[PDB]
């Protein structure tokens, strides 16, 4: 227990969890921006 607490293992786990959640949120935002959830947005793609 002293060795676990000496290496701030729970803190590193929390930081990794937060960074993973941030990365997942960014990836979800990017996917929502890329994927078209509407027919017209696809048709507008033809205009490009």
């Amino acid at each position: 227990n002293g060795e676990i607490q000496a290496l701030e293992l729970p803190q590193k786990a929390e930081a990794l969890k937060l960074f993973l959640e941030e990365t997942k949120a960014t990836v979800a935002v990017y996917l929502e921006s890329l994927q078209d959830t509407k027919i017209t947005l696809i048709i507008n793609w033809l205009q490009e």
Partner: protein
């Protein structure tokens, strides 16, 4: 003229972000074996 039915609209991921993939804190399950005493039941009365 283009089709109007999609399945991206059925997926919650393409609509709202989902910060999944969480990491539990680094802990340890502490479980100690009980102290089993038996000298109180039997008493060796024989000299060796």
């Amino acid at each position: 003229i283009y089709l109007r039915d999609l399945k991206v609209e059925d997926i919650p991921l393409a609509r709202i972000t989902l910060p999944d993939f969480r990491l539990p804190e680094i802990a340890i399950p502490e479980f100690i074996i009980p102290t089993l005493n038996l000298n109180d039941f039997q008493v060796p009365d024989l000299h060796i």
